[PDB]
């Protein structure tokens, strides 16, 4: 029933459309969903998929460490 | 039991290291796996993940078809 990434109890749906953080977060909310939390995916196999996509805190999720206000990225919605 | 993409009984495991097609194909074979067939993913929701990665035919999987650097790849069919 999960057309995406299944991990524990959360299903992650990829939105391949590039959008700003504000538009991505609003788009997930329009589907009763939120952007991924970085601490719940950082140490898992999910990082290879969620890399460079929007995190819930307004920053891209990055494995190894600009203007995040108008940059545009892909994103997952979960929950 | 699938730490990747599950679609219709097949599990796709992402390999994030960039490899040539020959080494990507050998890496899947060493685990009794194959690269995705384009005909099995093209019209599905998998296409957004497997796009630009190696297909079994030696070409990258593209949404619309019609330059041999290293790419990421999925393995399936363990």
């Amino acid at each position, epitope marked *: 029933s999960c057309n995406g990434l299944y991990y524990q109890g959360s299903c992650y749906i990829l939105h391949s459309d590039y*959008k700003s953080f504000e538009d991505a977060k609003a788009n997930c909310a329009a589907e009763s969903s939120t952007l991924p939390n970085k601490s719940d995916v950082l140490t898992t196999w999910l990082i290879d998929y969620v890399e460079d996509t929007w995190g819930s805190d307004g920053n*891209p999720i990055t494995k190894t460490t600009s*203007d995040v206000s*108008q940059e545009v990225r892909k994103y997952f919605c979960t929950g | 039991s699938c730490n990747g993409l599950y679609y219709q009984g097949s599990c796709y495991i992402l390999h994030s290291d960039y490899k040539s097609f020959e080494d990507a194909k050998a890496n899947c074979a060493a685990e009794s796996s194959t690269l995705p067939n384009k005909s099995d993913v093209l019209t599905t929701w998998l296409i957004d993940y497997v796009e630009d990665t190696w297909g079994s035919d030696g070409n990258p999987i593209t949404k619309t078809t019609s330059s041999q650097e290293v790419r990421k790849y999925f393995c399936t069919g363990s």
Partner: antibody
Amino acid sequence: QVQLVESGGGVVQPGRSLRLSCAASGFTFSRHGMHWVRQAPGKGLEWVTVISYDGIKKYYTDSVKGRFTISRDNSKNTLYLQMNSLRPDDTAVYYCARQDCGGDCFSRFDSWGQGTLVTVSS
Amino acid sequence: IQMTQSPSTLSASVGDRVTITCRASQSISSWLAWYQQKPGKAPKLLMYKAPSRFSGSGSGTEFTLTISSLQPDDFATYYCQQYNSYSLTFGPGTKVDLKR
């Protein structure tokens, strides 16, 4: 100090080819998408093409599709624009530019090269 | 899919509040930045952190640049930039010159 130095411009006859280069220094080249932008004499800026940080994705404006090819060499920190079937309307100053966002993204250009002149004329 | 900047030219004195508007025909996903270019030189990205006199405001079809206090260093041409559907586009440009 982020530096982008371009070369390869010059005068070339219509129908022939030219190759532009852009040497990058002062930043992690492999983590940033790169762009080419051109400006015809007396005209505005026109976006030409982008290549992703890892060289996988390339996109072009319509007027150069099939004629121009963007490429990059991350071990040499150099960006390339191979231009074929050059037309007189390709006459412009060409700039390379760096996206400031890291990885798979699109964003504003915070570093620009000094530009190199391309003149297409018989 | 037409992009216009109004006005194409404008005159202002040192110390004025200048507004440059850049519109689009439809929803263009996201406005990216404003750029300042002087003759003979490469364009320069405008940053809203320095007190910075530059401020951008984008609401769908409209993108606006505000220069709160103009100095003689700000007389140049300004270009908006936006991303839409795997491409980027600069606006036609607005030249700001010294009023007399």
